[PDB]
Amino acid sequence: YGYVRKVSGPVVIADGMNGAAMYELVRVGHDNLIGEIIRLEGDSATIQVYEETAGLMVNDPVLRTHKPLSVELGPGILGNIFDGIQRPLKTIAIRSGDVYIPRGVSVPALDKDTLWEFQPKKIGEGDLLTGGDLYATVFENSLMQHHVALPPDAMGKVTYVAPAGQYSLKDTVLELEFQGVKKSFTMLQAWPVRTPRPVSSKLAADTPLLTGQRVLDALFPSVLGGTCAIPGAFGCGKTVISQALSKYSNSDTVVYVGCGERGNEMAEVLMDFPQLTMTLPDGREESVMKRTTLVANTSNMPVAAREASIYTGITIAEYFRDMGYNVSMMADSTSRWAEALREISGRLAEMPADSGYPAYLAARLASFYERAGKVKCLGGPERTGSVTIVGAVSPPGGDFSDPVTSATLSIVQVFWGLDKKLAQRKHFPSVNWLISYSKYSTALESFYEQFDPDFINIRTKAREVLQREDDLNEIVQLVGKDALAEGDKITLETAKLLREDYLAQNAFTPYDKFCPFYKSVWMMRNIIHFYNLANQAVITYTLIKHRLGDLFYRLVSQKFEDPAEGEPALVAKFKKLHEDLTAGFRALE
Amino acid sequence: GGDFSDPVTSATLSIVQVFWGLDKKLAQRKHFPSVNWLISYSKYSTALESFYEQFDPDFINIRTKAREVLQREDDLNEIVQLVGKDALAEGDKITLETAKLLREDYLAQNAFTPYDKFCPFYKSVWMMRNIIHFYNLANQAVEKGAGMDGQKITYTLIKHRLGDLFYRLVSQKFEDPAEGEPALVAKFKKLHEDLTAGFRALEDETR
Amino acid sequence: LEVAMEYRTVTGVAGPLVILDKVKGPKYYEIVNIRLGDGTMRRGQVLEVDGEKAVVQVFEGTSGIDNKFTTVQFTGEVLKTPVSLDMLGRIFNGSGKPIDNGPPILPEAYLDISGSSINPSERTYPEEMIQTGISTIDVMNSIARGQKIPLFSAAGLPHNEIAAQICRQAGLVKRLEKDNFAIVFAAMGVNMETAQFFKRDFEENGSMERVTLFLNLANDPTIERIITPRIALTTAEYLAYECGKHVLVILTDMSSYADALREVSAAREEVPGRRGYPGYMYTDLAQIYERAGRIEGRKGSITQIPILTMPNDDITHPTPDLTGYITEGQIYIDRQLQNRQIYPPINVLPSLSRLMKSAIGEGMTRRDHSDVSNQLYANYAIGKDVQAMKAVVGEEALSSEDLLYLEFLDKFERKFVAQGAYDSRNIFQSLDLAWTLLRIFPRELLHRIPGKTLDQYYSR
Amino acid sequence: PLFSAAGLPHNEIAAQICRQAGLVKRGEEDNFAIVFAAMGVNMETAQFFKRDFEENGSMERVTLFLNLANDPTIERIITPRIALTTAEYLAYECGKHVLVILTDMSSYADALREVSAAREEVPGRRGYPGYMYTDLAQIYERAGRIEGRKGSI
Amino acid sequence: PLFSAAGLPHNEIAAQICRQAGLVKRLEKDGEEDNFAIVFAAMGVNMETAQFFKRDFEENGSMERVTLFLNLANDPTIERIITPRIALTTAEYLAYECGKHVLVILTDMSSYADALREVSAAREEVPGRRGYPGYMYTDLAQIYERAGRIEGRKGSITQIPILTMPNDDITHPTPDLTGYITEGQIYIDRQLQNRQIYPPINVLPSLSRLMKSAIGEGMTRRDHSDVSNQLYANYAIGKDVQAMKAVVGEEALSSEDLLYLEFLDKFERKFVAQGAYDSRNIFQSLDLAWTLLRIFPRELLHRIPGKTLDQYYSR
Amino acid sequence: VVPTVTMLGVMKSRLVGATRGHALLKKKSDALTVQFRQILKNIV
Amino acid sequence: LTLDEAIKTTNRRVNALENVVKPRLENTITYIKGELDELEREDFFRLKKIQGYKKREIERQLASS
């Protein structure tokens, strides 16, 4: 019930919708075009339709949905591929057979006829349960067990519990009554993208995001449930860091979110993920897709879907965190999302602000980024998850002055700063140590000292060495290495060794594909301790340089060792090398 | 006074085939025809190939050489604005001399006197050929390097001991068209012969 | 089976628009034919509809229309262009009506323009190279079947000559690796004189069985200039994914297309967007471009080389800066090189392809492609720097290597880049020329070249 | 005010000033009561403020008006109004001197810009509302000493 | 139109022109009809400026000749959009239908553009550049194109509408349109005023389309065009030389550079400057210009032809 | 200076030219410094 | 002596000239986009408001009849 009255491009006016609500999604026309309500002036409505509105007919029916832009969560959310508006691309392609996306597809987000193995918890048929209680878990696939949380805003004494067995989402797995009225819940939960997910308490982040790369792990650490920023426009560093996060990061899940980038780039990345495979610490070999969800909205996709992809991804990440899993979101191109928002604002004729973006761009970006953090779960049993966002930025020409870049730098705690200059100089990590920073180091210092009380001092010494590296750089630039003192020469040599041996990774090489934090800490110790032990001896720089050739080779090889030997063997080898270097530095003095 | 971003200007340049872009800077310097030769263009240069070939089968090459000379001079004007003509070599110096001669002789025209009231195509092409031939011969001479100096020494040699040809070149604009083509053509052919005598007589004693 | 009603209720004419009075159940983007009082015929498109109202944008202008003698006969359609396999080898007007003195197309299908987007799951990374015959493109800025590479130009620069050369010389590199190559050629808002150039080039090309020249003049109605690239993209999509044929598309002066979209948007009383261009221009250009790509389920592909004019000879203009993000490359035409009388004035050093690595490989093209490309890049840069230094150091103090780089720069500018307008060059002989230029330096001097390649080719 | 770009320790300076605030003493009942407005602060900054204020032991004389970035943008405009009204009541109508603190005034400016752009009002420089001077006056132009009363803001 | 900015003495030089304007033909020119019968129309003028003009006209003995239509700033704004039209109608009647040469001084045309802006805004019309009405060009054409000699009558109308750029620019719509329409542009530069030269007229931006018609051997020295075109070129090239020497140092300059700098100094000091009550005969002005030119050698005088050089390079 | 699109283009061109000239002057200064170091070594 | 002169010129260009020009470019960009572009939208927005008011008044007058 409801018919269109005026169709001016994307904007659509439909009469007979007195009961419509603002921002309620609606189905327009026989083709089931999907659009969101904007203005409810009079008894009429106003809808902007995402897909092309060409060919609409006056008095074509309009069908309400009684729900805002929402995502159907539950089993089967992992692995698949979804559009910006939560449209399963893979199943759409299989059903329609052809390649083109049909104008008005109506495939449900998750297949409601597929069977998943279900088994309840030890709860009783007449017990009491509340919102967020974990009443069952499902083996969606191997090694990615999926907990079934009773939806929030739903509570009451238990009435029926489905016994363990094979079931589908259409089955009524749960039914309960709060008052005399009883409600039955399936395995599918719908939640609006704009509304965040209910939380019990925002904890303080207390565990680093071990990305497997030494430069990010030690120099500029990032904590679970913490924002991150990447100036990714070239050098494939964004692809490299995304692959590292998918394969080696501590997160139990990853939710890539791609909006408004080049279509072939998304093709390349979405073909790269299935090829990516990660080995289990127990020796098992798995596929990253078994723990990966992908929301990719190319430029050809409607602008509104491009804007909504980010919120869809963050809501998916929050739902994953609802069962205490550590999940990491990855916004492919926030600049593209901002451009989509700008286009939408221009469609709405909103008053332009700085550089043309709407005045709420900073506010909306902050609202999105504020959802990341380590959070106590809702409902029992007690557990705690985390959501960390590693959303990248694409400043125009590298000038960190655009409002998107400025707002992101103002909100994001940790900025890693990939540099194209290092990429030109053949640097695999490509992380510019001169601009990167980790504002969460003060909070992470508790764990840093618990693991090793000397590690934080080593990090401070390394930061001082990096600061003096540029000083020695202009010193050599203006007068040369001749004017450098023995201590200055030792400091410069140690800085160069740190840059070319530990601060840089080798990625492609099997020995340096993954850098454990243990190996990173031992390498940092074997570098800094040797640097000091050589420093206080000032001894002729040439003499120590000649007599430390074996020590220099050991320091260089302190990163060539493969992780095959494991932590106990590599730690012992690094300790022996450090002791030998200390003996050589002290005895020869 | 307004850049090409003007909507009328952009619309015209999106359609117009030949742009005689006059520059206000040339108007300040009182260069009266005032066409800026860096920003102007003519997309008809390809269709006129037959007419240029039949009139003079070597005009295209001399025109391209003149364009290259003008572009090179405009390019190193910025460098001179920083360092100065001290580092200018023989080739650069001769290129700038030829560019200045082309700018003040060829590209100017009074139009208030019979010298420049109406320049027929033959007179213009003869001026262009004379200037380009002088440039090419001078470049070849300074590249010869005879007399153990050559180079800018040979440039000064041709600008001092051979400067009468230079003055006749810079005054060639005054060939009165009323004298008729058979007379002006003979005069320019004689000037070309005298120019060929130079840079060969100058090379006789090896500078 | 329904004969569309021919309403005669014109109740307002203004500019290009005519507002009908009491149309019963219109369609938003319907297409309507107008029979004026004098009997002449005009075709118009339907813009925003309302209660019984329908604003119609009329082609060919609106002169002579009167509110009591003009009939507006609807159709109930959305401009399904006629598409067939025999559409190749013929020149078409802006709206699709053939102008090659031939018959109208007998269609194998009526595909609606502005086709539905490709499922991103079904895309596949582009592979293999597409030979263009221009050395600067196929050596240092290689092109792969499936890219969307702009050709940024400016007013006065010979963009159309490069367009014609690409249209003629385009071919498949895989000739030596061991004919399904079609070139949908679209030209939007060309000058009145370049129309003769395009007609001549496509009337004596020698490979007419490949090209299809959709042509839209400047004085043709604007809405034709909007529809022309969409018609071309639809025909290319059909010939690629519905006929299994590799397809290349050249869009000429999409800045004119942007201006046409600006003209249409203003007529609908919409507020102008940033810098005058409508805000939806990003969506429009993304819609035009993203139709390319390689489909896993089909053996065909679409590769775009859209030619864009950058006003004021700068990239800050909204159209080039906007298309920079969508695409993955930039092949600039430099004004100074045109002044230097190098016929292809492509500034190779500024130019780059964001995914030129896919075209370079072993199976496709030749093994030494990446090495020679990088060596040429680096040596050109060095030569430019050395020329700049010689402008200020007097050139007497330059070392031997400085003179080597100077002569290499001169040779590269005057023998490699300056390809003739008709000197078709296969990639193999283009690389042979590159090696000819490279071999001047000592074998040990080419630092960027990896081992086992110098020994193979440096011996000539 | 304190002029300090993003990322600078101005929050730490504000916390130190508030915790160490006191008269010249050259009295405790009329001593400095601090009204601490917080317009558009991050959650981590909010927890830091709460913990730092609870640690100094001066909770007995400090009021926090916290407004996170999650809260609605219009609700941020009334936070300084409420803070200054409570300060006015404490100082003029009760006597004790009040040391009003508002963090991230640029967040308040952004809230004003968003609200004005919503209603499509006449824009000043940088798209800000043309009455921003008057609003910043109605916020700032309350500090001072009134003759008949011993308070001070 | 005299282009000026706020604070520059455009009113003073306008009064000087009013007091000094006269015929030149063979230096021969009662002349009551030759008397220019100045019609002065002031729009949006500070009362001090009106008093100044009144006193100057009274003192110069022209009180029986000049005519003043005043629209002071405190006076209603709308009357500023009628005052110049009234002045031009009065000038037309005094010249064409009465045979008197007439001179008109419209003052502060920007104060007329402001009235146009106010009227257009009050009507909710579509704005143009900087919010000015889209038809400001038509109004400015209507207000300027009402001057010029007419074949059938012995009269004439010559107007000097002074203009005030808002932020001392030219891209502003009002000075831009005035430059488009009017056949001239006299530029008064802030740089010259900062250097304390009473006539700050920058001779390089200046332009007169009908300059080639007024001059000539029949009414001026034969070298006038040459002299002007050479001084302009030397001043422009010398300014470029000074700009170069500002960065390369006074030492790096060549002999020609030093000659150009000396020419600039003596041109801006001895030539441009003139007394606030002292005129200069056109032949005296040409003599001064020739003294300025003769700094350079005969070779450097490229624009001047040898025929005029022989009669003037020595004098 | 008065702000305009042409003025913006002129300022951008001036900045680009200044950067190029600065690079050229830095190269010249480096060469002169190398020559001076060689002369000092020869004198020593 | 030559190196001192060249170094002085280079340092002056790096410090004074470029850092003088770049603020000028930023101010020119801000003056155009920050003001003229904003005003153009505001002018057109007010015009559209005037048109909407006229249409609403016409509709109300017709309904009152």
CB atoms D126 and A362 under 8 Å: no
The token pair that represents A46 in the structure block: 């106003």
Q: For strand C41-49 and strand B18-19, is the pairing parallel, antiparallel, or unpaired?
A: unpaired
Nearest Cα residue to E178 out of E108, E87, E104: E108
What one-character DSSP code corresponds to residue C221?
Answer: -
Alpha-carbon gap: F10 to the closest alpha carbon of chain G (Å): 9
- What is the DSSP code string of A169-197? TTS--EEEESSSSEEEE-S-EEEESSS--
Alpha-carbon gap: E56 to the closest alpha carbon of chain B (Å): 36
Which region, left, alpha or beta, applies to residue E37 given φ > 0 means left and ψ of -120 to 50 means alpha?
A: left
Q: Is B50 on the interface with C (CB under 8 A)?
A: no
Which residues partner with E5 through β-bridges?
E165
The answer to whether A150 and A379 are in contact (CB under 8 A) is yes
Nearest Cα residue to A82 out of A91, A74, A95: A91
Which region, left, alpha or beta, applies to residue A277 given φ > 0 means left and ψ of -120 to 50 means alpha?
A: beta
Chain F residue whose CA is closest to E171: F4
CB atoms C272 and G44 under 8 Å: yes
For chains C and E, having 3+ Cβ pairs within 8 Å is answered no
CB atoms F1 and G22 under 8 Å: no
For chains D and A, having 3+ Cβ pairs within 8 Å is answered yes
- Reported as type and span, the H/E element at residue A206 is none
CB atoms A93 and C119 under 8 Å: yes
Secondary structure (3-state) at B181: helix
For chains D and G, having 3+ Cβ pairs within 8 Å is answered yes
Alpha carbon distances (Å) from C451 to C359, C370, C443, E177 = 21, 13, 10, 69
CB atoms A6 and C50 under 8 Å: yes
Chain E residue whose CA is closest to F2: E169
Chain F residue whose CA is closest to B1: F6
- What is the DSSP code string of B6-17? SHHHHHHHTT-S
Contact list in C for residue B79 (CB cut-off 8 A) is 388, 391-392
Residue with tokens 């050479």: E230
Name subunits touching C (3+ CB pairs < 8 A): A, B, F, G
The answer to whether B13 and B19 are in contact (CB under 8 A) is yes
The token pair that represents E25 in the structure block: 């033909």
The answer to whether D139 and D108 are in contact (CB under 8 A) is yes
Interface test with E, best of G47, G48, G53 (most E CBs within 10 A): G47
How many Å apart are CA E16 and CA E5, to the nearest integer?
A: 18
Interface test with E, best of F1, F2, F7 (most E CBs within 10 A): F2
CB atoms G43 and E131 under 8 Å: yes
CB atoms A411 and D42 under 8 Å: yes
Q: Is B82 on the interface with F (CB under 8 A)?
A: yes
How many Å apart are CA C391 and CA B89, to the nearest integer?
A: 8
The token pair that represents A261 in the structure block: 């980038």
CA atoms within 13 A on the CB side of A188: 18
Name subunits touching A (3+ CB pairs < 8 A): C, D, G
Nearest Cα residue to C340 out of B64, B139, B98: B64
Residues of A forming the annotated binding site for ATP? 232-239
Nearest Cα residue to C95 out of C6, C227, C278: C227
What one-character DSSP code corresponds to residue C245?
Answer: -
Q: At what angle do helices B181-197 and B163-171 cross, to 10 degrees?
A: 160
- Reported as type and span, the H/E element at residue A137 is strand A134-138
How many Å apart are CA C453 and CA C372, to the nearest integer?
A: 10
How many Å apart are CA C348 and CA C330, to the nearest integer?
A: 10
Who's near D103: CB < 8 A, 6+ residues apart? D11, D14, D36, D37, D38, D39, D41
Interface test with F, best of G8, G11, G24 (most F CBs within 10 A): G24
The answer to whether C128 and C173 are in contact (CB under 8 A) is yes
How many Å apart are CA C131 and CA C429, to the nearest integer?
A: 12
Residues of A forming the annotated binding site? 232-239
Q: Is C146 on the interface with A (CB under 8 A)?
A: yes
Cα F21 to the center of its chain, rounded Å: 4
Which residues partner with A358 through β-bridges?
A352
Q: For strand A253-259 and strand A326-331, is the pairing parallel, antiparallel, or unpaired?
A: parallel
How many Å apart are CA C158 and CA C162, to the nearest integer?
A: 7
Tell me the backbone φ, ψ of residue E52, rounded to 5 degrees.
-60, -50
Which residues partner with C124 through β-bridges?
C294
Output the 3-class SS for chain E: CEEEECCCCHHHHHHHHHHHCCCCHHHCCCCCCCCCCCEEEEEEECHHHHHHHHHHHHHCCCCCCCEEEEEECCCCCHHHHCHHHHHHHHHHHHHCCCCCEEEEEEECCHHHHHHHHHHHHHCCCCECHHHCECCHHHHHHHHHCCCCCCCCCCCEEEECCCEEECCCCCCCHHHHHHHHHCCEEEEECHHHHHCCCCCCEEEEEEEECCHHHHCCCCCCCCCHHHHHHHHHHHHHHHHHHHHHHHHHCCCCCCHHHHHHHHHHHHHHHHHCCCCCCCCCCHHHHHHHHHHHHCCCCCCCCCCCCHHHHHHHCCC
AA identity, residue E227: V
For chains D and B, having 3+ Cβ pairs within 8 Å is answered no
Chain C residue whose CA is closest to G29: C316
User: Reported resolution in A?
Assistant: 3.9
How many Å apart are CA A235 and CA A245, to the nearest integer?
A: 17
Contact list in G for residue F12 (CB cut-off 8 A) is 25
Cα B133 to the center of its chain, rounded Å: 10
Q: Is B71 on the interface with C (CB under 8 A)?
A: yes
